[PDB]
Amino acid sequence: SMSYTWTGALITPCVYATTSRSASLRQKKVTFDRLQVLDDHYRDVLKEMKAKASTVKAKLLSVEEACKLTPPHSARSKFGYGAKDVRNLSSKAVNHIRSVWKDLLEDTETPIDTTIMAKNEVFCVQPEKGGRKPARLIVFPDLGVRVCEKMALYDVVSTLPQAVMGSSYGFQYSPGQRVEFLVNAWKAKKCPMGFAYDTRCFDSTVTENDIRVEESIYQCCDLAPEARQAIRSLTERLYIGGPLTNSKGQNCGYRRCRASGVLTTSCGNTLTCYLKAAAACRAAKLQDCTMLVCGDDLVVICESAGTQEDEASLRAFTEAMTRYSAPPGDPPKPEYDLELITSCSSNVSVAHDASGKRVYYLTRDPTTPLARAAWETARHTPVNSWLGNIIMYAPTLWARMILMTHFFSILLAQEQLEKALDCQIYGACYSIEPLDLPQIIQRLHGLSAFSLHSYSPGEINRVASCLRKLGVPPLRVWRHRARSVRARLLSQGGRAATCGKYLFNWAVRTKLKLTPIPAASQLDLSSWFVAGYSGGDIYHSLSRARPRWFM
Ligand SMILES: O=C(O)/C=C/c1ccc(NC(=O)C2(NC(=O)c3ccc4c(C5CCCCC5)c5n(c4c3)CC(=O)Nc3ccccc3-5)CCCC2)cc1
């Protein structure tokens, strides 16, 4: 079948930002027929995955529990209620949610309607590597269907990927734990070889069989009878496909591939990518494979068979993935240094802590983080990528010296340090106060994240070149700015002084001891690095369990 079918009605509207004006360029790329051929390797891996899914017991969420997972700014329903009414358990919201649920139990076939829209993402204007990127399209069902998805599948998509893929499931790892996994896997090989595999329009390559095989994995869970029917009905009416409706309410066509804005997008993509890749590893006869999968993002670490043999096994891996309908964008290349593998646009780098000890950490090219941060300072935005980047890339030179200094200077000026802000972590939305950042960083990266030095020449040059390219003042200006920022924060006491002392210890001439923050342990981070939820429409507010009067 065709991944998509179009009527001709436009995808109407809701350093550059991507708009609906480029949607036509994306539509051309994502529209094609899929030719999938399965084999014994695929069926074997699938049976192995299902045997692991069999150990899972999933709970049906109540209306109230599902309502609480709804983001405050989640797209309103076309049936006269919004995200605020859902969160407050309003009579109209709850009634419509209960009628949608009943309809999923009684109707097993009628396709559910979805909205199609162009995503507005900020990217850096690079004329050296061609031109602008067309907008990525987002396909999502109505708010009421989105609440029912959580009731039926929130526990499944949170528990199942880990039970099935084990250590291969990328979203169970904080950036440091991801780093620890890769270092340990690389060290485990006599002669290691690693590669990243990028699929061209992964969502489009997802066939209805891929989606039915994904349900066969869900059906291995211990499920409540109504959860079982809702999964069956949601697969048939929503997940395999359905009609597309633009922002103006006009028919845009149809979809027969993965919808990017459903709860099962991350889980489904991860299970599908793992299945195809694990099977392809066998077809290519790659020895002692270790995989790390995050949706469509795959990294394979294996035992090298020699330079020529490694290139031949990669073409074989690619031939198998292509048969499974997962062809590459850019063909994969073998790497023989862990630092050379770029996965989720990130790479491993090393530094030293205060005592000269080596510390591995995850970094990335800072152009997009800085360009998006510049856009976010220029105009008000719903989600703050700057906050998510400080959290995830806390040990990096660029997040410490530029993102922290810049945003703490703004927060000091606006007197908004205590004001909670929304950020994205593995697709889920988190409401976080900037004052909690020292504690969040200590928990995810360790106390060493505040003492790191001896950055590599390559990492330093990438940062310095990026600042020049973007017209950002040099690193010496940032150290000078951080000293004033730090001084002002220190004078305020409490969590504000903790921000000063810990986040900006790199800026002082002499450098302080830095003892662990005692209130860091109180932070409830139980739901943080469990699963991926991109497109899932998931929200969580940061909570502090058992506070002490003096902390
Ligand atoms: O050689 C020396 O001894 C000193 C050199 C030197 C050079 C430039 C300055 N610049 C400044 O003071 C001003 N801008 C900045 O002090 C500035 C701060 C952050 C900037 C950012 C981002 C960085 C990440 C957080 C969000 C802001 C960008 N740009 C920035 C400029 C340059 C800019 O204007 N825009 C962009 C566009 C895309 C990406 C980044 C930027 C403020 C008043 C005049 C311009 C200061 C000192």
Coordinates of C-alpha atoms and ligand atoms in Angstrom, one line a residue:
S1 CA 0.0 0.0 0.0
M2 CA 0.8 3.7 -0.4
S3 CA 2.3 5.2 2.8
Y4 CA 0.0 8.3 2.1
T5 CA -2.7 9.3 -0.5
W6 CA -3.5 13.0 -1.0
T7 CA -6.6 14.8 -2.2
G8 CA -4.7 18.0 -3.0
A9 CA -6.2 20.1 -0.1
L10 CA -3.2 21.9 1.5
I11 CA -1.7 21.1 4.9
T12 CA -3.0 24.5 6.3
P13 CA -1.3 26.5 9.1
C14 CA -2.1 26.3 12.9
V15 CA 18.5 30.6 11.5
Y16 CA 15.0 29.6 10.2
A17 CA 11.7 28.2 11.6
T18 CA 10.0 25.5 9.4
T19 CA 6.4 26.3 8.2
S20 CA 3.4 24.8 6.3
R21 CA 4.8 26.5 3.1
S22 CA 7.4 23.6 2.9
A23 CA 4.9 20.8 3.6
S24 CA 4.6 19.9 -0.1
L25 CA 8.3 19.1 -0.3
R26 CA 7.9 16.7 2.7
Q27 CA 4.7 15.2 1.2
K28 CA 6.7 14.1 -1.9
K29 CA 9.5 12.5 0.2
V30 CA 7.1 10.5 2.5
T31 CA 4.7 9.2 -0.3
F32 CA 5.7 5.8 -1.7
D33 CA 4.5 2.2 -1.9
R34 CA 6.2 -0.3 0.5
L35 CA 7.6 -3.7 -0.6
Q36 CA 8.3 -5.8 2.5
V37 CA 9.7 -9.4 2.3
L38 CA 10.1 -11.3 5.6
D39 CA 12.3 -14.2 6.4
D40 CA 13.3 -16.9 9.0
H41 CA 15.6 -14.4 10.9
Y42 CA 12.7 -11.9 11.3
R43 CA 10.2 -14.6 12.5
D44 CA 12.9 -16.0 15.0
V45 CA 13.6 -12.6 16.5
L46 CA 9.9 -11.8 16.8
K47 CA 9.2 -15.1 18.7
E48 CA 12.2 -14.3 21.0
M49 CA 10.7 -10.7 21.6
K50 CA 7.2 -12.2 22.3
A51 CA 8.5 -14.7 24.9
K52 CA 10.0 -11.7 26.8
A53 CA 6.7 -9.6 26.4
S54 CA 4.9 -12.6 28.0
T55 CA 6.5 -11.6 31.4
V56 CA 4.6 -8.2 31.4
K57 CA 1.5 -7.4 33.4
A58 CA -0.1 -4.1 32.4
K59 CA -2.7 -2.1 34.3
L60 CA -5.6 -0.2 32.8
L61 CA -5.4 3.5 33.8
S62 CA -8.5 5.1 35.2
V63 CA -10.0 8.3 33.5
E64 CA -8.6 10.5 36.3
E65 CA -5.0 8.9 36.0
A66 CA -5.1 9.4 32.2
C67 CA -6.5 12.9 32.6
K68 CA -3.5 13.8 34.9
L69 CA -1.0 12.8 32.2
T70 CA -2.5 15.3 29.8
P71 CA -0.3 18.4 29.1
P72 CA -2.0 21.7 30.1
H73 CA -1.5 23.1 26.5
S74 CA -2.6 19.8 24.7
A75 CA -4.7 20.5 21.6
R76 CA -8.4 20.9 22.4
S77 CA -11.1 18.5 21.3
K78 CA -13.5 19.3 18.5
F79 CA -16.2 18.1 20.9
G80 CA -16.3 21.3 23.0
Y81 CA -13.7 20.9 25.7
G82 CA -9.9 21.5 26.2
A83 CA -6.8 20.3 28.1
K84 CA -7.8 22.4 31.2
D85 CA -11.3 20.7 31.4
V86 CA -9.6 17.3 31.1
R87 CA -7.1 18.1 33.9
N88 CA -9.9 19.4 36.2
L89 CA -12.0 16.3 35.5
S90 CA -14.8 18.5 34.1
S91 CA -18.2 16.8 33.5
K92 CA -18.2 17.4 29.7
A93 CA -14.6 16.2 29.3
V94 CA -15.1 13.0 31.4
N95 CA -18.5 12.2 29.7
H96 CA -17.0 12.5 26.2
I97 CA -13.9 10.5 27.2
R98 CA -16.3 7.7 28.5
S99 CA -18.3 7.7 25.3
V100 CA -15.0 7.5 23.2
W101 CA -13.9 4.5 25.4
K102 CA -17.3 2.7 25.0
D103 CA -17.1 3.3 21.2
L104 CA -13.7 1.6 21.1
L105 CA -15.2 -1.4 22.9
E106 CA -18.2 -1.6 20.6
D107 CA -16.8 -0.5 17.2
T108 CA -13.8 -2.6 16.0
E109 CA -13.5 -1.3 12.3
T110 CA -14.5 2.4 11.6
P111 CA -11.3 4.4 11.0
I112 CA -10.7 7.2 13.6
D113 CA -10.1 10.7 12.2
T114 CA -6.7 12.4 12.6
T115 CA -5.4 15.9 12.1
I116 CA -2.3 16.6 9.8
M117 CA -0.1 19.6 10.5
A118 CA 3.4 20.9 9.7
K119 CA 5.7 21.0 12.7
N120 CA 7.5 24.4 13.4
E121 CA 11.1 23.5 14.3
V122 CA 14.0 25.9 14.4
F123 CA 17.2 24.9 12.4
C124 CA 20.3 26.8 11.6
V125 CA 20.6 28.5 8.1
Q126 CA 23.7 26.7 6.6
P127 CA 24.2 27.6 2.9
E128 CA 27.4 25.5 2.7
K129 CA 25.5 22.1 3.0
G130 CA 22.7 22.9 0.5
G131 CA 19.5 24.5 1.8
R132 CA 16.5 24.6 4.3
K133 CA 14.8 21.5 5.6
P134 CA 11.1 20.9 4.8
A135 CA 8.7 20.8 7.8
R136 CA 8.2 17.4 9.4
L137 CA 4.5 16.5 9.4
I138 CA 2.6 15.6 12.7
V139 CA -0.5 13.3 12.5
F140 CA -2.6 13.1 15.7
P141 CA -6.1 11.9 16.9
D142 CA -8.6 14.0 19.0
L143 CA -8.0 14.8 22.7
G144 CA -10.6 12.3 23.7
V145 CA -9.0 9.5 21.7
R146 CA -5.6 10.6 23.2
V147 CA -7.0 10.1 26.8
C148 CA -8.3 6.6 25.9
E149 CA -4.9 5.7 24.4
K150 CA -3.3 6.4 27.9
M151 CA -6.0 4.3 29.7
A152 CA -5.4 1.3 27.4
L153 CA -1.6 1.6 26.7
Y154 CA 0.2 4.0 29.1
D155 CA 1.4 1.1 31.3
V156 CA 2.2 -1.1 28.2
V157 CA 4.4 1.5 26.5
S158 CA 6.2 2.3 29.8
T159 CA 7.0 -1.3 30.8
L160 CA 7.0 -3.5 27.7
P161 CA 10.0 -2.0 25.6
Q162 CA 12.4 -2.6 28.6
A163 CA 11.0 -6.2 29.3
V164 CA 11.4 -7.1 25.5
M165 CA 14.7 -5.3 24.5
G166 CA 16.4 -5.2 27.9
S167 CA 19.6 -3.2 27.9
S168 CA 19.1 -2.4 24.1
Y169 CA 16.2 0.0 25.0
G170 CA 17.7 3.4 24.9
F171 CA 15.1 5.4 26.8
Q172 CA 15.7 3.6 30.1
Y173 CA 19.1 5.5 30.3
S174 CA 19.9 9.0 31.6
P175 CA 22.6 10.6 29.3
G176 CA 25.3 9.3 31.7
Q177 CA 23.9 5.7 31.9
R178 CA 23.6 5.8 28.0
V179 CA 27.3 6.7 28.0
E180 CA 28.2 4.0 30.6
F181 CA 26.3 1.3 28.4
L182 CA 28.2 2.3 25.2
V183 CA 31.7 2.4 27.0
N184 CA 31.0 -1.0 28.6
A185 CA 29.9 -2.5 25.3
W186 CA 32.8 -1.1 23.3
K187 CA 35.3 -2.4 26.0
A188 CA 33.6 -5.8 25.9
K189 CA 34.8 -6.4 22.3
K190 CA 38.4 -7.7 21.5
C191 CA 38.4 -5.5 18.3
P192 CA 35.3 -3.2 18.4
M193 CA 33.4 -1.8 15.4
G194 CA 30.4 0.4 15.7
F195 CA 27.9 2.1 13.3
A196 CA 24.8 4.2 13.2
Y197 CA 21.9 3.2 10.9
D198 CA 19.5 5.9 9.7
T199 CA 16.3 4.9 8.0
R200 CA 14.9 7.2 5.3
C201 CA 11.4 8.4 6.5
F202 CA 11.0 5.7 9.2
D203 CA 7.3 6.5 9.9
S204 CA 6.6 6.0 6.1
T205 CA 8.4 2.7 6.0
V206 CA 6.1 1.3 8.7
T207 CA 3.7 -1.2 7.0
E208 CA 0.3 -2.3 8.4
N209 CA 1.9 -5.7 9.1
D210 CA 4.6 -4.0 11.2
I211 CA 1.8 -2.4 13.2
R212 CA -0.1 -5.8 13.5
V213 CA 3.2 -7.6 14.6
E214 CA 3.6 -4.7 17.2
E215 CA 0.0 -5.5 18.5
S216 CA 1.0 -9.2 18.6
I217 CA 3.7 -8.2 21.1
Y218 CA 1.2 -6.0 23.2
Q219 CA -1.3 -8.9 23.3
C220 CA 1.4 -11.1 25.1
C221 CA 0.9 -8.8 28.2
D222 CA -1.5 -9.7 31.0
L223 CA -4.3 -7.2 30.2
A224 CA -7.8 -6.4 31.5
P225 CA -10.5 -7.5 29.0
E226 CA -11.4 -3.9 28.0
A227 CA -7.6 -3.0 27.6
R228 CA -7.3 -6.0 25.3
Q229 CA -10.3 -4.8 23.2
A230 CA -9.2 -1.2 23.2
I231 CA -5.7 -2.2 21.9
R232 CA -7.4 -4.4 19.1
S233 CA -9.8 -1.6 18.1
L234 CA -7.1 1.2 18.3
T235 CA -4.8 -1.0 16.1
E236 CA -7.5 -1.5 13.4
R237 CA -9.1 2.0 13.5
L238 CA -6.1 4.2 14.3
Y239 CA -2.6 2.7 14.4
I240 CA -2.7 0.9 10.9
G241 CA -4.2 4.0 9.2
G242 CA -7.1 6.4 8.7
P243 CA -8.2 9.6 7.0
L244 CA -6.2 12.9 7.3
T245 CA -7.9 16.3 8.1
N246 CA -6.2 19.6 7.8
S247 CA -6.4 22.4 10.4
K248 CA -9.4 23.9 8.4
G249 CA -11.4 20.7 8.6
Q250 CA -10.9 19.6 5.0
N251 CA -10.0 16.1 3.8
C252 CA -6.3 15.9 3.0
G253 CA -6.3 12.2 2.1
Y254 CA -5.3 9.0 3.9
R255 CA -2.4 7.4 5.9
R256 CA -1.4 3.6 5.8
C257 CA 1.8 4.1 7.8
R258 CA 2.9 5.2 11.4
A259 CA 1.2 8.3 12.8
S260 CA 3.8 10.5 14.6
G261 CA 1.3 11.8 17.2
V262 CA -0.1 8.6 18.8
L263 CA 0.9 7.2 22.2
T264 CA 2.5 4.0 20.6
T265 CA 4.8 6.0 18.2
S266 CA 8.0 5.7 20.3
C267 CA 7.3 2.2 21.6
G268 CA 6.2 0.9 18.2
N269 CA 9.1 2.5 16.4
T270 CA 11.6 1.1 18.9
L271 CA 10.1 -2.4 18.8
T272 CA 10.0 -2.3 14.9
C273 CA 13.5 -0.9 14.5
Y274 CA 14.9 -3.4 17.0
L275 CA 13.1 -6.4 15.3
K276 CA 14.3 -5.4 11.8
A277 CA 17.9 -4.6 13.0
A278 CA 18.3 -7.7 15.2
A279 CA 17.1 -9.9 12.2
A280 CA 19.4 -8.0 9.8
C281 CA 22.4 -8.5 12.1
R282 CA 21.9 -12.2 11.6
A283 CA 21.5 -11.9 7.8
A284 CA 24.8 -9.9 7.7
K285 CA 26.5 -12.5 10.1
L286 CA 27.8 -9.7 12.4
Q287 CA 29.5 -11.2 15.4
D288 CA 28.7 -10.4 19.1
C289 CA 26.2 -7.5 18.4
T290 CA 25.2 -5.0 21.0
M291 CA 22.4 -2.6 19.9
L292 CA 21.1 0.7 21.3
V293 CA 17.7 1.7 19.9
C294 CA 15.7 5.0 20.4
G295 CA 12.7 4.9 18.0
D296 CA 14.2 5.0 14.5
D297 CA 17.7 5.8 16.0
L298 CA 19.9 2.6 15.9
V299 CA 23.6 2.0 16.9
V300 CA 25.3 -1.4 16.5
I301 CA 28.5 -2.2 18.4
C302 CA 30.0 -5.5 17.3
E303 CA 33.3 -7.6 16.9
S304 CA 35.3 -6.4 13.8
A305 CA 36.0 -9.1 11.1
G306 CA 38.5 -6.9 9.3
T307 CA 38.3 -3.6 7.3
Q308 CA 37.0 -5.2 4.0
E309 CA 34.8 -7.7 5.8
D310 CA 33.2 -5.0 8.0
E311 CA 32.3 -2.9 4.8
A312 CA 30.8 -6.1 3.2
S313 CA 28.8 -7.0 6.4
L314 CA 27.3 -3.4 6.5
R315 CA 26.1 -3.6 2.9
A316 CA 24.6 -7.0 3.8
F317 CA 22.9 -5.5 7.0
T318 CA 21.5 -2.7 4.7
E319 CA 20.3 -5.2 2.0
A320 CA 18.3 -7.1 4.8
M321 CA 16.8 -3.8 6.4
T322 CA 15.8 -2.7 2.9
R323 CA 13.9 -6.0 2.3
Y324 CA 12.1 -5.4 5.7
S325 CA 11.2 -1.9 4.3
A326 CA 13.7 0.2 6.3
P327 CA 16.2 1.5 3.6
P328 CA 18.9 4.0 4.6
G329 CA 19.0 7.7 4.2
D330 CA 22.7 7.9 4.3
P331 CA 24.5 4.5 4.0
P332 CA 26.1 3.3 7.3
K333 CA 29.8 3.6 7.8
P334 CA 32.0 1.5 10.2
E335 CA 33.7 3.4 13.0
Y336 CA 36.7 2.1 15.1
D337 CA 36.6 4.7 17.9
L338 CA 33.5 5.1 20.2
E339 CA 33.8 8.9 20.0
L340 CA 33.3 8.7 16.2
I341 CA 29.7 7.2 16.4
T342 CA 27.0 9.9 16.1
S343 CA 23.7 8.6 17.6
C344 CA 20.6 10.8 18.5
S345 CA 22.9 13.6 17.0
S346 CA 25.2 12.9 20.0
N347 CA 28.7 11.5 20.6
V348 CA 30.8 10.3 23.6
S349 CA 33.6 12.6 24.8
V350 CA 36.0 12.4 27.8
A351 CA 36.9 15.0 30.5
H352 CA 38.5 14.9 34.0
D353 CA 36.8 15.6 37.3
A354 CA 38.4 17.7 40.2
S355 CA 40.8 14.8 41.2
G356 CA 42.1 14.2 37.6
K357 CA 39.9 11.1 37.1
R358 CA 38.5 10.4 33.6
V359 CA 34.8 11.0 33.1
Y360 CA 32.9 10.0 29.9
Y361 CA 30.0 12.2 28.9
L362 CA 27.6 12.7 26.0
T363 CA 27.9 15.9 23.9
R364 CA 26.6 17.0 20.4
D365 CA 27.3 19.8 17.9
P366 CA 26.0 23.0 19.6
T367 CA 24.7 24.9 16.5
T368 CA 21.0 23.7 16.7
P369 CA 20.9 24.0 20.6
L370 CA 22.3 27.6 20.4
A371 CA 20.1 28.7 17.4
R372 CA 16.9 27.3 19.1
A373 CA 18.0 29.0 22.4
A374 CA 18.5 32.4 20.4
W375 CA 14.9 32.0 18.9
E376 CA 13.6 31.3 22.5
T377 CA 15.2 34.5 23.9
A378 CA 13.8 36.5 20.9
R379 CA 10.2 35.5 21.3
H380 CA 8.0 33.6 23.9
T381 CA 7.8 29.8 23.2
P382 CA 5.6 27.0 24.7
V383 CA 8.5 24.6 25.3
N384 CA 12.1 25.7 26.2
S385 CA 14.7 23.6 24.4
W386 CA 17.3 25.6 26.4
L387 CA 16.2 24.0 29.7
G388 CA 16.1 20.5 28.3
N389 CA 19.6 21.0 26.8
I390 CA 21.0 22.3 30.2
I391 CA 19.4 19.2 31.8
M392 CA 20.7 16.6 29.2
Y393 CA 24.0 18.2 28.3
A394 CA 24.9 19.6 31.8
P395 CA 28.5 18.2 31.6
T396 CA 29.2 19.9 28.3
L397 CA 31.4 23.1 27.8
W398 CA 28.7 24.9 25.7
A399 CA 25.7 24.2 28.1
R400 CA 27.8 25.3 31.2
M401 CA 29.5 28.4 29.7
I402 CA 26.8 29.7 27.3
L403 CA 23.3 28.2 28.1
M404 CA 23.6 28.5 31.9
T405 CA 25.3 31.9 32.0
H406 CA 22.8 33.4 29.4
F407 CA 19.6 32.1 30.9
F408 CA 20.5 32.7 34.5
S409 CA 21.3 36.3 33.6
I410 CA 17.8 36.6 32.0
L411 CA 16.0 34.9 34.9
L412 CA 17.9 37.2 37.4
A413 CA 16.7 40.3 35.4
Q414 CA 13.1 39.1 35.0
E415 CA 13.2 37.8 38.7
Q416 CA 11.7 34.5 37.4
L417 CA 14.1 31.9 38.9
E418 CA 11.3 30.2 40.9
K419 CA 8.8 30.2 37.9
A420 CA 8.3 26.6 36.5
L421 CA 9.0 26.1 32.8
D422 CA 8.1 23.4 30.3
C423 CA 10.8 21.3 28.7
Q424 CA 10.9 18.0 26.7
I425 CA 12.8 14.9 28.0
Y426 CA 12.4 11.8 25.7
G427 CA 9.3 13.3 24.1
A428 CA 7.5 13.7 27.5
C429 CA 6.8 17.3 28.9
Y430 CA 8.3 18.3 32.3
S431 CA 7.4 21.4 34.3
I432 CA 10.6 22.3 36.1
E433 CA 11.8 25.3 38.1
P434 CA 15.3 26.5 37.1
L435 CA 16.1 26.7 40.9
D436 CA 16.0 22.8 41.0
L437 CA 18.7 22.5 38.2
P438 CA 21.7 21.8 40.6
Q439 CA 19.8 18.9 42.2
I440 CA 18.5 17.5 38.8
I441 CA 22.1 17.7 37.4
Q442 CA 23.6 15.9 40.5
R443 CA 21.0 13.1 40.2
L444 CA 21.4 12.6 36.4
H445 CA 25.2 13.3 35.9
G446 CA 26.8 13.2 39.3
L447 CA 28.5 15.8 41.4
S448 CA 31.5 15.7 39.0
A449 CA 29.3 17.5 36.3
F450 CA 30.1 20.7 38.2
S451 CA 33.9 20.0 38.3
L452 CA 34.7 18.8 34.8
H453 CA 37.7 20.2 33.0
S454 CA 40.4 18.9 30.5
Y455 CA 37.9 19.0 27.6
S456 CA 39.3 17.6 24.3
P457 CA 40.8 19.9 21.6
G458 CA 38.2 18.6 19.2
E459 CA 35.3 19.5 21.5
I460 CA 36.8 22.9 22.4
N461 CA 37.3 23.8 18.7
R462 CA 33.8 22.7 17.7
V463 CA 32.3 25.0 20.4
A464 CA 34.7 27.9 19.6
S465 CA 34.0 27.6 15.8
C466 CA 30.3 27.5 16.4
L467 CA 30.3 30.7 18.5
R468 CA 32.3 32.5 15.7
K469 CA 29.9 31.2 13.0
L470 CA 26.8 32.3 15.0
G471 CA 28.1 35.7 16.1
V472 CA 28.1 34.7 19.8
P473 CA 30.7 36.4 22.0
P474 CA 33.8 34.2 22.7
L475 CA 34.3 31.9 25.8
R476 CA 36.4 34.5 27.7
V477 CA 33.3 37.0 27.7
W478 CA 31.1 34.1 29.1
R479 CA 33.5 33.5 32.0
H480 CA 33.4 37.2 32.9
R481 CA 29.5 37.2 32.7
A482 CA 29.3 34.0 34.8
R483 CA 31.2 35.7 37.7
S484 CA 28.6 38.5 38.0
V485 CA 25.7 36.0 37.5
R486 CA 27.3 33.7 40.2
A487 CA 27.9 36.6 42.6
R488 CA 24.2 37.8 42.4
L489 CA 22.9 34.2 42.8
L490 CA 25.2 33.6 45.9
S491 CA 23.8 36.8 47.6
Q492 CA 20.2 35.4 47.4
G493 CA 20.7 32.3 49.5
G494 CA 18.7 29.0 49.3
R495 CA 18.4 27.2 46.0
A496 CA 19.5 30.4 44.2
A497 CA 23.0 30.4 45.9
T498 CA 23.2 26.6 45.2
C499 CA 22.7 27.5 41.4
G500 CA 25.6 30.1 41.9
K501 CA 28.0 27.8 43.8
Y502 CA 27.4 24.6 41.8
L503 CA 26.5 25.7 38.2
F504 CA 29.2 28.4 38.0
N505 CA 32.1 26.8 40.0
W506 CA 33.9 26.6 36.6
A507 CA 34.0 30.5 36.4
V508 CA 35.9 31.2 39.7
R509 CA 39.8 31.5 39.8
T510 CA 40.3 29.2 42.8
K511 CA 37.4 26.6 42.6
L512 CA 35.4 25.4 45.7
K513 CA 35.2 21.9 47.3
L514 CA 31.5 21.2 46.4
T515 CA 29.8 18.7 48.8
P516 CA 26.6 16.8 47.7
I517 CA 23.4 18.8 47.9
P518 CA 21.4 17.1 50.7
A519 CA 17.9 17.9 49.2
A520 CA 18.8 16.3 45.8
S521 CA 17.6 12.8 47.1
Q522 CA 14.1 14.2 47.8
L523 CA 13.4 14.8 44.1
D524 CA 11.0 12.3 42.6
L525 CA 12.6 11.2 39.3
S526 CA 10.9 7.8 39.2
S527 CA 9.3 8.5 35.8
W528 CA 12.2 10.3 34.1
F529 CA 14.3 7.7 32.3
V530 CA 11.8 4.9 31.9
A531 CA 10.4 5.3 28.4
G532 CA 10.2 7.5 25.3
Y533 CA 6.9 9.2 24.5
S534 CA 7.6 11.3 21.4
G535 CA 4.1 12.2 20.0
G536 CA 2.6 10.6 23.1
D537 CA 1.2 13.9 24.5
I538 CA 2.6 13.1 28.1
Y539 CA 3.0 15.5 31.0
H540 CA 4.6 15.4 34.4
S541 CA 5.2 18.1 37.1
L542 CA 8.4 17.8 39.1
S543 CA 7.7 16.7 42.7
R544 CA 9.7 16.7 46.0
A545 CA 9.0 13.7 48.4
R546 CA 9.8 14.1 52.2
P547 CA 11.2 17.7 52.5
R548 CA 13.3 18.8 55.6
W549 CA 12.4 22.1 57.4
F550 CA 16.1 23.4 57.0
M551 CA 16.7 22.3 53.4
Ligands
LIG1 O1 36.7 40.0 21.8 C1 36.2 40.4 22.8 O2 37.0 40.7 23.9 C2 34.8 40.6 23.0 C3 33.9 40.4 22.0 C4 32.4 40.5 22.1 C5 31.7 40.2 21.0 C6 30.3 40.3 21.0 C7 29.6 40.7 22.1 N1 28.2 40.8 22.1 C8 27.4 41.5 22.9 O3 27.7 42.1 23.9 C9 25.9 41.5 22.5 N2 25.4 40.1 22.2 C10 25.6 39.1 23.0 O4 26.1 39.2 24.1 C11 25.1 37.7 22.6 C12 24.7 36.8 23.6 C13 24.1 35.6 23.2 C14 23.9 35.3 21.9 C15 23.3 34.2 21.2 C16 22.6 33.0 21.9 C17 23.5 32.1 22.6 C18 22.8 30.9 23.2 C19 21.7 31.4 24.2 C20 20.8 32.3 23.5 C21 21.5 33.5 22.8 C22 23.4 34.4 19.9 N3 24.1 35.6 19.7 C23 24.4 36.2 20.9 C24 25.0 37.4 21.2 C25 24.4 36.3 18.4 C26 23.1 36.7 17.9 O5 22.8 37.9 17.8 N4 22.1 35.8 17.5 C27 22.2 34.4 17.6 C28 21.7 33.6 16.6 C29 21.8 32.2 16.6 C30 22.5 31.6 17.6 C31 23.0 32.3 18.6 C32 22.9 33.7 18.7 C33 24.9 42.1 23.5 C34 25.1 43.6 23.2 C35 25.8 43.8 21.8 C36 25.7 42.4 21.3 C37 30.4 41.0 23.3 C38 31.7 40.9 23.3

